[PDB]
Write a protein that binds this ligand. Structure first.
Ligand SMILES: O=[N+]([O-])c1ccc(OP(=O)(O)O)cc1
Length: 159
């Protein structure tokens, strides 16, 4: 697991055993934005809702927002993501399956709006702790679309 900003927002792939989830809890995680797709989760645990139940079990408030592999959040989802992340600062963990593409994208989209950084730079930061962060033209297109509305993106959020 990795921290982008120490204890405010970090990420990882999809855990396989409970311990790994207590690894999060121990490294400082408090909340969790689950990014995998239903089937992606269950192929690992056997039951999506069961996984979300243990997430809540260890406290961690789980917000499940599905994002297909190599894809990007939908305008609504994203705003729904920020409202979530930008409303608890401490302990955020964004995870998908590999914790490289979809997670890298979301973290970067966070930095872009929080630290007002351009894409290639936000990416550069995330790849600093998460090597190879962001893997599809789709995601790059998004981040760009984001950076081009860091204005409304925030007005939308902090409304
Ligand atoms: O190995 N995999 O099956 C796999 C690896 C990475 C994936 O996507 P990510 O979590 O956005 O990096 C999705 C699936």
């Amino acid at each position: 697991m990795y921290w982008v900003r120490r204890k405010t927002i970090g990420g990882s792939g999809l855990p396989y055993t409970e311990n790994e989830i207590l690894e999060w809890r121990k490294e400082g995680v408090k909340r969790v934005l689950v990014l995998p797709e239903d089937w992606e989760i269950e192929e690992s645990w056997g039951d999506k809702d069961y996984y979300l139940s243990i997430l809540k079990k260890n406290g961690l408030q789980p917000l499940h927002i599905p994002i297909p592999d190599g894809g990007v959040p939908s305008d609504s989802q994203f705003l729904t993501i920020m409202k979530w992340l930008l409303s608890e600062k401490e302990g955020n963990l964004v995870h998908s399956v590999g914790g490289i593409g979809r997670t890298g994208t979301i973290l970067a989209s966070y930095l872009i709006l929080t630290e007002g950084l351009e894409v290639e730079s936000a990416i550069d930061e995330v790849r600093l702790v998460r090597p190879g962060a962001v893997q599809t033209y789709e995601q790059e297109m998004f981040l760009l679309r984001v950076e081009g509305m860091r204005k409304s993106w925030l007005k939308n959020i902090y409304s």
